[PDB]
Design an enzyme around this catalytic site. Structure first.
Site, PDB file in Angstrom:
ATOM      1  N   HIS C 202       7.016  23.008 -21.913  1.00  0.00           N
ATOM      2  CA  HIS C 202       5.954  22.616 -22.456  1.00  0.00           C
ATOM      3  C   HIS C 202       6.460  21.730 -23.735  1.00  0.00           C
ATOM      4  CE1 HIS C 202       1.630  23.079 -22.606  1.00  0.00           C
ATOM      5  NE2 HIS C 202       1.466  23.257 -23.735  1.00  0.00           N
ATOM      6  N   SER C 206       5.450  17.526 -18.562  1.00  0.00           N
ATOM      7  CA  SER C 206       5.704  16.973 -17.285  1.00  0.00           C
ATOM      8  C   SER C 206       6.540  15.703 -17.279  1.00  0.00           C
ATOM      9  CB  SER C 206       4.556  16.949 -16.510  1.00  0.00           C
ATOM     10  OG  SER C 206       4.193  18.366 -16.201  1.00  0.00           O
ATOM     11  N   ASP C 229      -5.723  19.518  -8.057  1.00  0.00           N
ATOM     12  CA  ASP C 229      -5.161  20.668  -7.613  1.00  0.00           C
ATOM     13  C   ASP C 229      -6.248  21.223  -6.606  1.00  0.00           C
ATOM     14  OD1 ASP C 229      -2.750  20.462  -9.011  1.00  0.00           O
ATOM     15  OD2 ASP C 229      -3.251  21.709 -10.525  1.00  0.00           O
TER      16      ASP C 229
HETATM   17  C1  HEM Z   1       6.552  30.955  -8.469  1.00  0.00           C
HETATM   18  C2  HEM Z   1       7.335  29.725  -8.332  1.00  0.00           C
HETATM   19  C3  HEM Z   1       6.987  28.701  -9.266  1.00  0.00           C
HETATM   20  C4  HEM Z   1       5.820  28.233 -10.002  1.00  0.00           C
HETATM   21  C5  HEM Z   1       4.536  29.200  -9.761  1.00  0.00           C
HETATM   22  C6  HEM Z   1       6.013  27.204 -10.661  1.00  0.00           C
HETATM   23  C7  HEM Z   1       5.041  26.321 -11.296  1.00  0.00           C
HETATM   24  C8  HEM Z   1       5.295  25.072 -11.821  1.00  0.00           C
HETATM   25  C9  HEM Z   1       4.029  24.450 -12.449  1.00  0.00           C
HETATM   26  C10 HEM Z   1       2.553  24.737 -12.401  1.00  0.00           C
HETATM   27  C11 HEM Z   1       4.718  23.222 -12.886  1.00  0.00           C
HETATM   28  C12 HEM Z   1       4.146  22.212 -13.607  1.00  0.00           C
HETATM   29  C13 HEM Z   1       3.317  21.318 -12.424  1.00  0.00           C
HETATM   30  C14 HEM Z   1       4.168  20.673 -11.339  1.00  0.00           C
HETATM   31  O1  HEM Z   1       5.000  19.926 -11.636  1.00  0.00           O
HETATM   32  O2  HEM Z   1       4.141  20.861 -10.385  1.00  0.00           O
HETATM   33  C15 HEM Z   1       6.083  23.467 -12.543  1.00  0.00           C
HETATM   34  C16 HEM Z   1       6.930  22.512 -13.018  1.00  0.00           C
HETATM   35  C17 HEM Z   1       8.316  22.650 -12.959  1.00  0.00           C
HETATM   36  N1  HEM Z   1       9.083  23.297 -12.231  1.00  0.00           N
HETATM   37 FE1  HEM Z   1       8.329  24.918 -11.144  1.00  0.00          FE
HETATM   38  N2  HEM Z   1       7.327  26.638 -10.469  1.00  0.00           N
HETATM   39  C18 HEM Z   1       7.960  27.535  -9.678  1.00  0.00           C
HETATM   40  C19 HEM Z   1       9.152  27.613  -9.163  1.00  0.00           C
HETATM   41  C20 HEM Z   1      10.330  26.542  -9.879  1.00  0.00           C
HETATM   42  C21 HEM Z   1      11.654  26.617  -9.237  1.00  0.00           C
HETATM   43  C22 HEM Z   1      12.270  27.533  -8.102  1.00  0.00           C
HETATM   44  C23 HEM Z   1      12.149  25.466  -9.990  1.00  0.00           C
HETATM   45  C24 HEM Z   1      13.458  25.033  -9.776  1.00  0.00           C
HETATM   46  C25 HEM Z   1      14.585  25.380  -9.108  1.00  0.00           C
HETATM   47  C26 HEM Z   1      11.108  24.881 -10.726  1.00  0.00           C
HETATM   48  C27 HEM Z   1      11.307  23.988 -11.607  1.00  0.00           C
HETATM   49  C28 HEM Z   1      10.421  23.457 -12.291  1.00  0.00           C
HETATM   50  C29 HEM Z   1      10.727  22.238 -13.029  1.00  0.00           C
HETATM   51  C30 HEM Z   1      12.014  21.471 -13.383  1.00  0.00           C
HETATM   52  C31 HEM Z   1       9.417  21.585 -13.296  1.00  0.00           C
HETATM   53  C32 HEM Z   1       9.004  20.457 -14.276  1.00  0.00           C
HETATM   54  C33 HEM Z   1       8.750  19.321 -13.115  1.00  0.00           C
HETATM   55  C34 HEM Z   1       8.173  18.058 -13.756  1.00  0.00           C
HETATM   56  O3  HEM Z   1       6.975  17.979 -14.099  1.00  0.00           O
HETATM   57  O4  HEM Z   1       8.825  17.030 -13.667  1.00  0.00           O
HETATM   58  N3  HEM Z   1      10.058  25.680 -10.439  1.00  0.00           N
HETATM   59  N4  HEM Z   1       6.333  24.628 -11.890  1.00  0.00           N
HETATM   60  C1  LIG Z   2      -4.539  31.381 -17.999  1.00  0.00           C
HETATM   61  C2  LIG Z   2      -3.534  31.219 -19.354  1.00  0.00           C
HETATM   62  C3  LIG Z   2      -2.451  31.336 -18.867  1.00  0.00           C
HETATM   63  C4  LIG Z   2      -1.510  30.206 -18.748  1.00  0.00           C
HETATM   64  C5  LIG Z   2      -0.604  29.932 -17.401  1.00  0.00           C
HETATM   65  C6  LIG Z   2      -1.719  29.947 -16.200  1.00  0.00           C
HETATM   66  C7  LIG Z   2      -1.204  28.918 -15.182  1.00  0.00           C
HETATM   67  C8  LIG Z   2      -0.972  27.364 -15.721  1.00  0.00           C
HETATM   68  O1  LIG Z   2      -0.397  27.181 -16.473  1.00  0.00           O
HETATM   69  O2  LIG Z   2      -1.780  26.467 -15.173  1.00  0.00           O
HETATM   70  C9  LIG Z   2      -1.995  25.340 -14.918  1.00  0.00           C
HETATM   71  C10 LIG Z   2      -3.172  24.872 -13.978  1.00  0.00           C
HETATM   72  C11 LIG Z   2      -0.474  24.876 -13.968  1.00  0.00           C
HETATM   73  N1  LIG Z   2      -0.624  23.647 -13.709  1.00  0.00           N
HETATM   74  C12 LIG Z   2       0.215  22.650 -14.617  1.00  0.00           C
HETATM   75  O3  LIG Z   2       0.607  22.940 -15.166  1.00  0.00           O
HETATM   76  C13 LIG Z   2      -0.074  21.249 -13.663  1.00  0.00           C
HETATM   77  C14 LIG Z   2       0.690  20.277 -14.630  1.00  0.00           C
HETATM   78  C15 LIG Z   2       0.564  18.973 -14.110  1.00  0.00           C
HETATM   79  C16 LIG Z   2       0.007  18.527 -13.049  1.00  0.00           C
HETATM   80  C17 LIG Z   2      -0.639  19.563 -12.182  1.00  0.00           C
HETATM   81  N2  LIG Z   2      -1.356  19.342 -10.852  1.00  0.00           N
HETATM   82  C18 LIG Z   2      -1.121  17.827 -10.429  1.00  0.00           C
HETATM   83  O4  LIG Z   2      -1.753  17.534  -9.406  1.00  0.00           O
HETATM   84  C19 LIG Z   2      -0.408  20.851 -12.529  1.00  0.00           C
HETATM   85  O5  LIG Z   2      -1.264  21.852 -11.954  1.00  0.00           O
HETATM   86  C20 LIG Z   2      -0.187  26.109 -13.162  1.00  0.00           C
HETATM   87  O6  LIG Z   2      -0.471  26.017 -12.031  1.00  0.00           O
HETATM   88  O7  LIG Z   2       0.407  26.775 -13.547  1.00  0.00           O
HETATM   89  C21 LIG Z   2       0.404  28.314 -13.163  1.00  0.00           C
HETATM   90  C22 LIG Z   2       1.675  28.528 -12.515  1.00  0.00           C
HETATM   91  C23 LIG Z   2       0.108  29.064 -14.424  1.00  0.00           C
HETATM   92  O8  LIG Z   2       0.072  30.573 -13.945  1.00  0.00           O
HETATM   93  C24 LIG Z   2       1.437  31.290 -14.559  1.00  0.00           C
HETATM   94  O9  LIG Z   2       2.377  30.871 -15.238  1.00  0.00           O
HETATM   95  C25 LIG Z   2       1.285  32.807 -14.406  1.00  0.00           C
HETATM   96  C26 LIG Z   2       1.759  32.994 -12.882  1.00  0.00           C
HETATM   97  C27 LIG Z   2       0.561  32.614 -11.930  1.00  0.00           C
HETATM   98  C28 LIG Z   2       2.890  32.447 -12.437  1.00  0.00           C
END
Ligand code: HEM
Ligand SMILES: CCCCCC[C@H]1C(=O)O[C@H](C)[C@H](NC(=O)c2cccc(NC=O)c2O)C(=O)O[C@@H](C)[C@@H]1OC(=O)CC(C)C
Ligand SMILES: CCCCCCCCCCCCCCCCCC(=O)OC[C@H](COP(=O)([O-])OCC(O)COP(=O)([O-])OC[C@@H](COC(=O)CCCCCCCCCCCCCCCCC)OC(=O)CCCCCCCCCCCCCCCCC)OC(=O)CCCCCCCCCCCCCCCCC
Ligand SMILES: CCCCCCCCCCCCCCCCCC(=O)OC[C@H](COP(=O)([O-])OCC[N+](C)(C)C)OC(=O)CCCCCCCCCCCCCCCCC
Ligand SMILES: CCCCCCCCCCCCCCCCCC(=O)OC[C@H](COP(=O)([O-])OCC[N+](C)(C)C)OC(=O)CCCCCCCCCCCCCCCCC
Ligand SMILES: CCCCCCCCCCCCCCCCCCCC(=O)O[C@H](COC(=O)CCCCCCCCCCCCCC)COP(=O)(O)OCCN
Ligand SMILES: CCCCCCCCCCCCCCCCCCCC(=O)O[C@H](COC(=O)CCCCCCCCCCCCCC)COP(=O)(O)OCCN
Ligand code: HEC
Ligand code: HEC
Ligand code: HEM
Ligand code: HEM
Ligand code: HEM
Ligand SMILES: CCCCCCCCCCCCO[C@@H]1O[C@H](CO)[C@@H](O[C@H]2O[C@H](CO)[C@@H](O)[C@H](O)[C@H]2O)[C@H](O)[C@H]1O
Lengths: 85, 54, 383, 244, 383, 244
Positions: C202, C206, C229
């Site tokens: 944050h 992104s 989403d």
């Molecule tokens: C439970 C597994 C995970 C969850 C729920 C999760 C969730 C997310 C979310 C919601 C974002 C912002 C939206 C997006 O770019 O898709 C994000 C960005 C990111 N995640 Fe994950 N993630 C997970 C696992 C991982 C893993 C395994 C990696 C790396 C090996 C990773 C590296 C990153 C990085 C570098 C970003 C920033 C990407 C960008 O916006 O350019 N995450 N993740």
């Molecule tokens: C409820 C208050 C607690 C705040 C955390 C809640 C969740 C939260 O941050 O939500 C957002 C909706 C987030 N997506 C993004 O950032 C996002 C940013 C850019 C583009 C897209 N999509 C494009 O097309 C995105 O979707 C997301 O999916 O993240 C979950 C993982 C988070 O849950 C948690 O970490 C807790 C647990 C479920 C892992």
């Protein structure tokens, strides 16, 4: 490297006018048919080689390996199998 | 369209009430419709179809 | 001031799900993060529900899973949902990591979210490994035996560590009961690390598919990305529906419907598909300890991408040679996966070694070379 | 590996239950129960199935109670603490032919006949494997095959030598519905029945799946409309730049 | 800039445990918050360890607890630590809540941390109730039966809800297995709410024993309160040591060493001591539904303290009449606790009713009257 | 409730194990085992104790193996799947006098003698209750008490009528160490033994407690010094105010 609304960290902006119209005033699917056909074709054609080349190479390698392995475990492949082990 | 908007859509309370009432009706009618359709495509195969012999 | 901004609790939620400023040009590969959140929510809901009906004792475990399938109302659904969503969790995580590598999401200033991400991935692997043992079928038992015996390779103390992990001299009841407790825990740990990697992100926000700053042009997370989403939530639910309702056992191994038997050894002991590439890497090295190190290194090497990528430009959108190399790297990783489940036979043995070398040489040689040359090509080409 | 070591792959037969919208044929399930009961049950248990499971699938409440009541099960001890038997109830599980593994192996030249409750899921091939195996004993093993003692040649079985002999022959069962009991007919019915035993939620699961597919597809379509509606001001944005 | 301030993850920890500005005059009653954190950490560590050896199936549950006591290395310690720390958790929570009521910690601007605190307290009660059932001794079973039958009082749907909670027609195996899954979960929920109430507090900071602002004179959390918290950590460990090693069963009921028997009813079915005051309040009302409402209301009424306290001054340090009333309120709450475990006999029946009336009249009548009069006394007295 | 309904409260006897630093007397434990074995074991089980539990507490490895080897336990079935017995091993649990509850009640006029493995923890009073109960059968019930059939008067038992008769009489046991086996001596030994059975970690637990107490006390003292050291600049602060 990111601020928040009002101080996002942009260099100063000046001279750009932006315009748009309400979602209720616009046709959301305007030009959908043209996009679905021509835009997608353009986008796909320009990326096709980056998918085709590696996929075709690794599929070829796999096909050769799997066919050899199958042949080595037949009667005909007995001798070549003996050498391979 | 004005009348419809004014009664069912304009107030969110009314809009949500209308959506939930519609969901209730959908749920009951869809159940019945799927049940009948499923019975016709699988006719003669189900227990309910052979039960009468026993 | 709006309450969403004034109240500190509401303001934290506001900062992540509502006012969060996002680039305006994220493509559908930015949807995997919320799909991973969806998989996590499904696994928590289904997993806690299974825990209400499952018995971790080895004399009852396999039968408690049959009781879930046969007697518990909708037990079949809850079990199939949990088992299939574990596979979907890995599809989404590989897509998410693939996006991150292609778009340079690991580059400064996002090294820290990427590095925490690598730990998330390791925690997912451990979580899924322990969950699979809980069925206590043939693959459960024999997969636990082979994987836990890898620890025997640790010099001097390895054997002692294995007996300590098992709680005895082979995989048995003590092992199963401890795997249940740890399987229940690990998802909570994983949720914490998922939150940590987003807090770390944050600070920079992104990245975006062009690799440039988005500070010039931001969009609120809601409603734009909320509604974007939802599209992939429903696409995911359609895929989920087709597996859970129409083909619930397609991704599984039939041998796990045979109760664990320490006497009889299954024809082939293979891991779940999502671990197969790591297994092929292990097999490639003849030494036991060598193989273990290579297999761990195959994951830990992701941590050096921020160093070995020498590009002055973030991501591959504008880099034709990097794009070709990335394509070969991905297809090689899929081939390693296929080689993880063939028999140890010619000519797959040598193939597995060549693919293993290529996997490591991407990080150590090819990406540093290609990224160096492309830097020069951009500069000379645009003079 | 050799093809022999893997076993021949079974044909894909067109089962009634193949098909996204197709249930089992319950008449085939009933006939398959009768083959289990008169042939397989001599050596194989079906331990995960209770009498109540047949009710409203293959049999009425009364038919299943009649099957249960013909057997004796262990009751709670009497008042002097001595063992007692009771007649069976719908809650009881179908009892197996052997008290333990050792008894089972002793009756089958060392081989252990598996419990068949999950066999359709516990083997690659499912119903097709069971049908192929039961109908795939050749009169003579292929020239050159040496069978171990007490083994029978069956190409579908990995390695080729199986401890179970052929058991289905034309007319070993007399079906109660008048169907001609050929080898093929009985193998098809029993394979259907065992598939049901492995997955008794099958029919309900697929009907709920149909409902899910329809709702989720509609919601996917509407989510696309709503996304495009909300995004159109961004997509339609235009700029005029006048350099300062 | 120091790394602890620059890095966003480190900065969050920094904000709570290091640079956090605290009043310089907190007394030892401000130590209960970190003791509650210690109890929570002990319960997580001991509870997850017990879960590795415990079996939730009713045929094995009680015996798995005997196996822990007899066969698992240090199993006796882990079990006694878990059982006694549950009692210490309630001692600390009552002290913490007592401090908050005496010092006016519920007043603006701290209504939100106080209100989340009330939910924490409810979650603790549910957590401990379910954990006690897991032993499946006589008190486990019979306490579950009587407490779950209180839900039958819910009009129209009450009986249906009870059968749904039990998973059957009495407390049995389905109930025990679901209580295990929920007992494992609830502490994680409780840790989240504990964190939420501290985030909510962080906007105003800690109150202090004088009730005035501390913005004039702050001290860093570390080293001052870190080292002050260690004193009570070791005082707590000494108390813990005396129970766990020298008197591990003092706080328990002998009947819970008899295996659950649905036929035989124990002589007296009483809750664990920490629930006794709420039980006395329930008994006081003759109606079943009345009693349930009063018992819930006895906890929910804490939410109205911010309204019924009319004082212009925060806390009781300078309020002699409020201090006397508080003393009566506390001693009445202890008497209610004692009356919760007497037999339903004269003259304890009427006594329980008078004490129940006094409990509620503190919130509804006495505190609003006394706080109004003291306002006038401060103003006239200092003219 | 009436005192009768509660039962008389047992005296506090000075057990060797009373006392923060005191272990059980192992010689009394050994003698108590012999009373269990020769008197109580006719009606009461000790199901949670294995032969290995006695070793290094009351008996040597060899003595306990000898006790185990004299009994027969159910083995795994033989090769025809028929039942077999084997001699006992150290891993085996001490076997009870009855096959089930019904047999136990039938032998005891309806009453069920409880398993004694946890009895010292499962009753208020512990060892004192067991000693009081065994030694507290008066020759005659207090005038006016009407015993139900098959009941014996014992004031320590709630309600007063217990289904267990007096069993300890001078010289029912001959101790192997030459101790005079009086009613009181045997009740003391068996109460000690049953207390051990309920809490076999007792001796180790209290010694670890002593170590914990010492370390934690020292750390408490040092934490006070360190807190006061760090706080002294705050406590010693002085102010001079000059109103602006
Ligand atoms: C439970 C597994 C995970 C969850 C729920 C999760 C969730 C997310 C979310 C919601 C974002 C912002 C939206 C997006 O770019 O898709 C994000 C960005 C990111 N995640 Fe994950 N993630 C997970 C696992 C991982 C893993 C395994 C990696 C790396 C090996 C990773 C590296 C990153 C990085 C570098 C970003 C920033 C990407 C960008 O916006 O350019 N995450 N993740
Ligand atoms: C409820 C208050 C607690 C705040 C955390 C809640 C969740 C939260 O941050 O939500 C957002 C909706 C987030 N997506 C993004 O950032 C996002 C940013 C850019 C583009 C897209 N999509 C494009 O097309 C995105 O979707 C997301 O999916 O993240 C979950 C993982 C988070 O849950 C948690 O970490 C807790 C647990 C479920 C892992
Ligand atoms: C459980 C886990 C174990 C951990 C233990 C933690 C408990 C520590 C704590 O909060 O209490 C210590 C605490 C000492 O804390 P402190 O920070 O020095 O003073 C806090 C008071 O506000 C200061 O109160 P004060 O300065 O007005 O002094 C009052 C106190 C005297 O306090 C002294 O210590 C002296 O004496 C009494 O009130 C005794 C009442 C007389 C009865 C006769 O003891 C009390 O003062 C208890 C008074 C409650 C009635
Ligand atoms: C299989 C091989 C894939 C090669 C991809 C090459 C680029 C391409 O054509 O993709 C289309 C697009 C091209 O998008 P782009 O963002 O480069 O270009 C957009 C259009 N222009 C150039 C005009 C701005 O690539 C993606 O969207 C790539 C995302 C990668 C996800 C990979 C998942 C694999 C999982 C394995 C994990 C280990
Ligand atoms: C038992 C009855 C307790 C009465 C307390 C009255 C005040 C008193 O003397 O306390 C000493 C001290 C007085 O401290 P003080 O902060 O008012 O005064 C300090 C000294 N002067 C006035 C000079 C500034 O009070 C406390 O420290 C009270 C904390 C209350 C904790 C209660 C725990 C009960 C749990 C039940 C929960 C429901
Ligand atoms: C946990 C796993 C999440 C995945 C859920 C997808 C399908 C599961 C629903 C169960 C099911 O079989 O429902 C069918 C309909 O599907 C549907 O119509 C459900 C698909 C809807 C998609 C998801 C929308 C919200 C769901 C999640 C919200 C849950 C909490 C929010 C309050 C038919 O079942 P039936 O119609 O016979 O059922 C009785 C009511 N007549
Ligand atoms: C979880 C529960 C927390 C409470 C711990 C108290 C004592 C538990 C340890 C067992 C014990 O009795 O230790 C004794 C010594 O006391 C001691 O020295 C232990 C007292 C020290 C208390 C606080 C120290 C750390 C506690 C938690 C820190 C966690 C970090 C790493 C685990 C006996 O000694 P022994 O002979 O059994 O010892 C083996 C090496 N000789
Ligand atoms: C009198 C003995 C006997 C009868 C009758 C019998 N079986 Fe078997 N069956 C066996 C034995 C023995 C095995 C184990 C064979 C082995 O592992 O070598 C077996 C194995 C099987 C297997 C598993 C083969 C595998 O892949 O492991 C299936 C499926 C099977 N039987 C189904 C049936 C069905 C369906 C019937 C009758 C309608 C049937 N059996 C009748 C003795 C019998
Ligand atoms: C021949 C029968 C018999 C013998 C010998 C016997 N008991 Fe018992 N015992 C019983 C019966 C029956 C009960 C249940 C009494 C009841 O609940 O009314 C019982 C109950 C007890 C109780 C529990 C009383 C309670 O509070 O519930 C203890 C403790 C006890 N016995 C210990 C012993 C000890 C120690 C010995 C011998 C050294 C012993 N018993 C010998 C038959 C016997
Ligand atoms: C990241 C989240 C999780 C993943 C990836 C995961 C993965 C798995 C896997 C692969 C299995 C084997 C499934 C099968 O083939 O039957 C399993 C089983 C199980 N999981 Fe999880 N799980 C997760 C979360 C949880 C949680 C939070 C619980 C809470 C207890 C839980 C409880 C169970 C139980 C009881 C089983 C055994 C019953 C069964 O096989 O279905 N899981 N898990
Ligand atoms: C707030 C935290 C917790 C509290 C207040 C608490 C309370 C309790 C209580 C009162 C018991 C009955 C203990 C007894 O008399 O034997 C118990 C048992 C149990 N608890 Fe917890 N517990 C907590 C956290 C946990 C956690 C996180 C787990 C992880 C699984 C857990 C697992 C168990 C198990 C397995 C038992 C049964 C075995 C036993 O009785 O010792 N507990 N808990
Ligand atoms: C797991 C249980 C809990 C933990 C770990 C916890 C922890 C803490 C901590 C560390 C503090 C700051 C230091 C202190 O004042 O002691 C605090 C303050 C506070 N807690 Fe709690 N607490 C818990 C339960 C509760 C409950 C049940 C309530 C209310 C009913 C509550 C209400 C408050 C309030 C109002 C404050 C601010 C007090 C002030 O500084 O004036 N907490 N808590
Ligand atoms: C075991 C718990 C799991 C990990 C959670 C870590 C602790 C909880 C932190 C979440 C709260 C963050 O919410 C916010 O964080 C920032 C960043 O430090 C903090 O901000 C606070 O400290 C900074 C500097 O230290 C000050 O500039 C600021 O004025 C002050 O509000 C506050 O605490 C809170 O306004």
């Amino acid at each position: 490297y990111m601020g928040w609304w009002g101080h996002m960290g942009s260099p100063p902006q000046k001279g750009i006018a932006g315009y748009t119209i309400s979602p209720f005033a616009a046709r959301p699917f305007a030009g959908v048919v043209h996009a679905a056909i021509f835009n997608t074709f353009r986008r796909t054609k320009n990326q096709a080689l980056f998918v085709i080349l590696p996929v075709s190479f690794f599929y070829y390698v796999w096909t050769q390996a799997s066919e050899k392995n199958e042949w080595l475990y037949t009667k005909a492949g007995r001798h070549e199998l003996a050498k391979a082990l | 369209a004005t009348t419809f908007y004014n009664v069912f859509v304009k107030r969110n309370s009314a809009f949500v009430a209308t959506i939930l009432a519609s969901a209730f009706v959908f749920d009951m009618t869809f159940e019945t419709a799927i049940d009948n359709f499923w019975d016709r495509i699988n006719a003669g195969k189900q227990w309910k179809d052979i039960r009468h012999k026993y | 001031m709006a309450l969403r901004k004034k109240n500190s609790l509401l303001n934290m939620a506001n900062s992540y799900v509502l006012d969060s400023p996002q680039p305006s040009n994220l493509n559908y590969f930015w949807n995997f993060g919320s799909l991973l959140a969806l998989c996590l929510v499904i696994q928590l809901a289904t997993g806690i529900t299974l825990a209400m009906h499952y018995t971790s004792h080895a004399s009852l475990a396999f039968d408690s899973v049959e009781h879930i399938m046969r007697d518990v109302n909708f037990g079949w659904f809850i079990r199939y949902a949990h088992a299939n969503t574990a596979s979907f969790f890995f599809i989404c995580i590989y897509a998410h990591m693939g996006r991150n590598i292609y778009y340079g999401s690991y580059k400064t200033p996002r090294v820290l979210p990427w590095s925490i991400g690598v730990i998330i991935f390791l925690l997912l692997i451990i979580t899924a490994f322990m969950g699979y043992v809980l069925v206590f079928g043939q693959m459960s038992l024999w997969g636990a035996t082979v994987i836990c015996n890898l620890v025997s390779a640790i010099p001097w103390l390895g054997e002692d560590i294995v007996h300590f992990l098992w709680g005895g001299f082979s995989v048995g009841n003590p092992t199963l009961q401890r795997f249940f407790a740890l399987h229940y825990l690990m998802p909570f740990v994983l949720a914490v690390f998922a939150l940590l990697h987003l807090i770390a992100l944050h600070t920079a926000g992104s990245s975006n598919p062009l690799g440039i700053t988005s500070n010039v042009d931001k969009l609120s997370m809601h409603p734009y990305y909320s509604f974007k989403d939802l599209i992939t939530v429903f696409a995911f639910l359609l895929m989920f529906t087709l597996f859970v309702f129409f083909s619930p056992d397609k991704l599984g191994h039939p041998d796990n419907y045979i109760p664990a038997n320490p006497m009889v050894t299954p024809a082939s002991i293979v891991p779940e598909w999502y671990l197969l590439p790591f297994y092929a890497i292990l097999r490639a090295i003849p030494d036991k300890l060598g193989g273990v190190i290579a297999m761990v290194a195959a994951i830990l090497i992701l941590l050096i991408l921020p160093i070995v990528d020498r590009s002055i430009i973030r991501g591959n959108a504008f880099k034709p040679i990097s794009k070709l190399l990335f394509g070969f790297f991905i297809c090689n990783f899929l081939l390693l996966g296929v080689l993880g489940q063939v028999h140890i036979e010619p000519p797959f043995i040598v193939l597995g070694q060549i693919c293993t070398i290529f996997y490591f040489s991407y990080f150590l040689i090819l990406l540093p070379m290609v990224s160096t040359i492309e830097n020069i090509f951009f500069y000379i080409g645009s003079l | 590996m050799t093809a022999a070591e893997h076993g021949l792959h079974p044909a894909e037969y067109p089962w009634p239950q193949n098909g996204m919208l197709s249930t089992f044929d319950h008449a085939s399930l009933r006939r398959g129960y009768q083959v289990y009961k008169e042939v397989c049950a001599a050596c194989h248990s079906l331990d995960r199935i209770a009498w109540r499971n047949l009710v409203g699938v293959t049999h009425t409440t009364d038919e299943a109670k009649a099957f249960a009541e013909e057997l004796e099960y262990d009751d709670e001890p009497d008042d002097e603490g001595n063992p007692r038997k009771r007649p069976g109830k719908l809650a009881d599980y179908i009892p197996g032919p052997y008290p333990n593994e050792q008894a089972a192996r002793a009756a089958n030249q060392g081989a252990l006949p598996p419990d068949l409750s999950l066999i359709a899921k516990a083997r690659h091939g499912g119903a097709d494997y069971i049908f192929a195996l039961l109908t795939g004993y050749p009169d003579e093993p292929p020239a050159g095959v040496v069978l171990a003692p007490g083994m029978n040649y069956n190409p579908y079985f990995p390695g080729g030598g199986i401890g179970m002999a052929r058991t289905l022959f034309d007319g070993v069962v007399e079906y109660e519905d008048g169907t001609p009991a050929t080898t093929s007919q009985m193998a098809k019915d029993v394979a259907a029945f065992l598939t049901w035993a492995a997955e008794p939620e099958h029919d309900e699961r697929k009907k709920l799946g149909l409902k899910a597919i329809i709702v989720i597809s509609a919601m996917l379509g509407l989510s696309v409309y709503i996304k495009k509606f909300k995004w159109s001001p961004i997509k339609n944005r235009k700029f005029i730049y006048n350099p300062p």
